[PDB]
């Protein structure tokens, strides 16, 4: 097992690039319900009475409308952060990085990346759900909105303001900018920079010198390409990968099913049918039975609305988090641990998903650690010398200085150290020569 | 359109300082409702019966009380982060920066900044709203609280614990500290520092050397002053700028209006008036009709309470975000992209607003980009040299090194580069002389 | 009072390490309620009727189940971030830091730290609460779940998936890793490093050179040890320190008490007892009275469920914040102001608490500030020199350069300054000699 030591340090001699996907729901289907059609359907005697209950219907209808509008804002706040659409890079001559699975391709009319085309297939809408049956009733015609609503007990699904194609186009712009302009494309003009240099400068942000990339550019490129390939298989095989997006769809479907099914409930009355009770009873007695169904059908709808408001808040938080991660992880480089995947964040790539966003985080994780003896300071000519950058390490009989995240032994010289103190205060100082550079 | 290139880099030759306002709601009006006065008003027969319904009234009353207390905490958590009130700086001899529109002035008794005096005028309370009518009924007297509540169907608005003047005083302290003590005033004692130096050190935090400020101090000062002037006009002209704060006020007003209006509803009864039904009917029949209004007037109030709880959660999240932004953007310098406005964050200034906070974010955005040929490394004497800071750029026949966010060509010397490798591994290395400093 | 000055700077000559605790609720008791036992208990006539009300019971039961599952996820997302359990460090020979109050000890079978053993005692469950009475009814037996539920009006508390011991074991692993492997244990392999070096490198992250730790290691160690001792007394004495955790427990207890007490309510009927009304009335009249209690007992339970959903969202946000702070504050070093305690964040230590987490944040706050005259640049041989790091300060007749967060006057030399401009542009430049290093 791991054991502490007062004079031993472990420094990584190698590295492995990894890509970790994170899926967050961003929006919900713009479902809506009419309160004067769910309770009373075609009946004129049930409406007159429902007016005496005041604003109850108007309150629930307005609440659902707010949720629908919130879904449009949620999507805009995430994907619309950049609207200076960057043109796709036609030069397929990067330094080995094969974005072919990340960027779109022309071999299909959907203009979606191979990963996006898989995500859009893993999430599906069942034929038993009213969300699909309502669409078949319209047939893209808008005039039959009220006709289909009357058939589906007043259920109405509004069309999203931004189509799936618009979201894909916005995501492509973010990708092209990051690949061609780095993190600065989101903080100003399209300051183009070569991608190998961009990675070299991102390495310096995680304490790794630019040298490591250039001397390992082919190896680093191969690692990135393999990681992007493996994630596609992982999502394809694992059926419960996009559960976060499927769960929100399933939850909304169950809510509508329970709401519509409750119309078949008597709530303590002679029947669930308003024409049957109104024909069996006389007027001075039917209104007692037609008041029990109205009150049961109002609490049912109120339960649906209140549950949707709670669910909408969860999606709103996820959408805000997604927008924050797009800015920090995609448009920049987040130093915050675990915010842009495991390991040190280098860069991330966004991918569109149905009612959600998938972030591909590229991170640097050290590997192949090796033990080395270390000392806090070096003593020379009575002066105590400290490392300006990196750590002092001992290769048996010799002492060297090296980067903390990559083993690179260098001779201890005045150019990489600084001096302070009379060598009598630093506990554990070791005597070693410092050469003049 | 923008095009990628493997050997071209764009570096900005100039900069434009910009100020972007962000408005967040922090609190809500401390509205409260009594459940034994909304349903039954002055009637003793309606109360006896309302007791049989158990704790329903106590649950709703306690819920509203919690919301009111939460509003006080929300404001305290945002503005009370610093309470060592810093004295206003009477020396109007900064390095050109004209905070006169940001700081208070003595020409008015409100002691609010010119921007604050505009924000407090763009948000207004209508005379038709009960929030104002309740205040006119009290006339600052506290003894008539119960008398005015009985008139307004039990509606009662509690006074905020912190007055608008207290919030302004707290904001002034934060401003004076930031202007006179920088980001350290919030992490320890009032370590005073000259403002030009403070900006010079904030520039170094965004990759821009201190030199750029000193050689452009007058230009930078003029840019800041113009930006602070333009924002005042923007808020004055644009009527939908403070909508986030007006929307929460409007939403609460509509909720009370719908609640009070529902008292005029029969909920399926002989009349909405309890004395009328109780006088027309005998006792063994009036209780059937006085049970239908109690149940309608309880779900109405329950709908108001539940909707307020959902709205209070949204304000709580905004208040927490505002407190986080005050610490990160005002008391410090946030590296997180888009968290403290567009562009690289330099500093921000807080301004008080009715039930909200307005953050003025000052950011650095590069401008006037110019294309330059770049190489990843320099080859000299067979050794490959890499840039210690900045990027190598070619001015036609000559190669230079320059900062990434400001064009400053310097001769390539050992003092600004480091060496590694035998010049046979770096792809794209170029041969150029490195001079001895 | 503090006063601004254009040529004076304050630099701290000393420092005081401080430890500030932050308590956040992470989970809630897995309470659950059966909807066909709260309303109708043992009665077969009340169930037949309750079926006509449709899915109402199934909706409320499913909602409570989701909350219970959410509590398990909340705890896992916070504590399970690391599962490579690090072995306790048996070498009690650190550089003076006495973690004995932070780490567990073997003198007790609970295997909890002295601070953890106090936190687990300050929060208690009253004997009048059903949460305890339900446990006494089971006696650790699982077969009597349904029997005890029938006695407690259908109330059922589920056992947590992770026991208190498992949470303590996970917290110990995080502590051992941080003490023996620093922030890298959470971003890769267990890269061991000596603790004094780890603190020396964390100091460099707050602008303080490693020198300050080594020359003050004994003083810094003593300060840390004293701070850890004082916090234990603070929590022991202050009774309202863990209120955030006690409040959530109290709120849930009151909710169940109000729910169960409402069974004693007539809701406008002949009695709250179903056998009494069903025996006094004939069948064609008892169903009118047995429909009024069902509807009152359904809105009561619905009010409990909706309030719990609102409360569960608050805990979910706190749990997410706790997980974020564990990653940023414990597994790393957060530059974000006020996110990991007052002052500059050095490191933090986690401690388990009942249904919550306590973070011990160790921060650096400067002290003993001293005024010094400063200049933005130095003029020599007509060239304007700027400080590469730190600030220029004047000790009366002599000019020196020093770190911004620690007074360390050094001679101005080319090794600690850089040159730019012709000395005619920098406003406030002072003439002083720069020596050749
Ligand atoms: C580092 O790891 C990679 C894994 O792809 C391996 O190919 C390589 O040989 C290892 N060593 C070095 C020095 O790169
Ligand atoms: C990128 O990967 C795909 C995988 O199918 C491959 O077809 C393509 O040739 C690769 N690109 C290059 C330049 O080899
Ligand atoms: C490093 O240690 C090995 C093992 O003792 C030795 O063979 C080698 O020469 C050492 N390195 C140098 C530069 O002497
Ligand atoms: C940079 O932009 C400012 C805009 O105010 C302009 O005055 C100035 O001439 C431009 N060029 C330089 C070198 O500052
Ligand atoms: C600051 O701006 C205001 C704008 O009205 C102006 O009156 C004032 O003179 C300015 N300050 C200075 C020092 O010029
Ligand atoms: C930079 O390029 C221009 C255009 O060729 C040239 O006139 C100028 O002399 C170059 N700079 C230097 C320092 O030679
Ligand atoms: C700094 O503060 C500590 C407080 O513990 C004190 O012991 C010490 O004498 C002070 N001065 C120095 C130079 O450390
Ligand atoms: C650590 O503190 C405890 C406090 O009771 C003390 O008993 C123990 O001796 C201390 N450790 C050392 C090494 O002195
Ligand atoms: C610093 O100032 C004091 C007071 O004038 C003086 O005694 C001392 O000699 C100065 N330091 C140096 C290095 O001259």
Author numbering:
A (entry chain B), B (entry chain A), C (entry chain C): 704 to 1140
Cite, word for word, the article reporting this structure.
The spike is composed of two subunits, S1 and S2. S2, in contrast, is the most evolutionarily conserved region of the spike and can elicit broadly neutralizing and protective antibodies. Although immunogenically appealing, prefusion S2 is metastable as it irreversibly transitions to a stable, postfusion conformation when S1 is removed.
HexaPro-SS-Δstalk is an S2-only construct derived from the prefusion-stabilized SARS-CoV-2 HexaPro spike. We use this dynamical information as a basis to design two cavity-filling tryptophan substitutions (V991W and T998W) that alter the conformational landscape of S2, stabilizing the closed prefusion conformation. The cryo-EM map of the HexaPro-SS-2W was processed with C3 symmetry and DeepEMhancer63 sharpening. 2D classes, especially the top-down views, indicate that the closed prefusion conformation is predominant in HexaPro-SS-2W. The structure highlights key residue interactions also observed in the WE simulation, showing a densely packed cluster of hydrophobic residues at the S2 trimer’s apex. In this region, an extended network of π–π interactions encompassing W991, W998, Y756, F759, and F970 surrounds an ordered salt bridge (D994–R995). T998W shows clear cryo-EM density of the sidechain, filling the cavity in between the CHs of the S2 trimer. By stabilizing the S2 trimer’s apex with V991W and T998W, we were also able to resolve the fusion peptide proximal region (FPPR, residues 835–857).
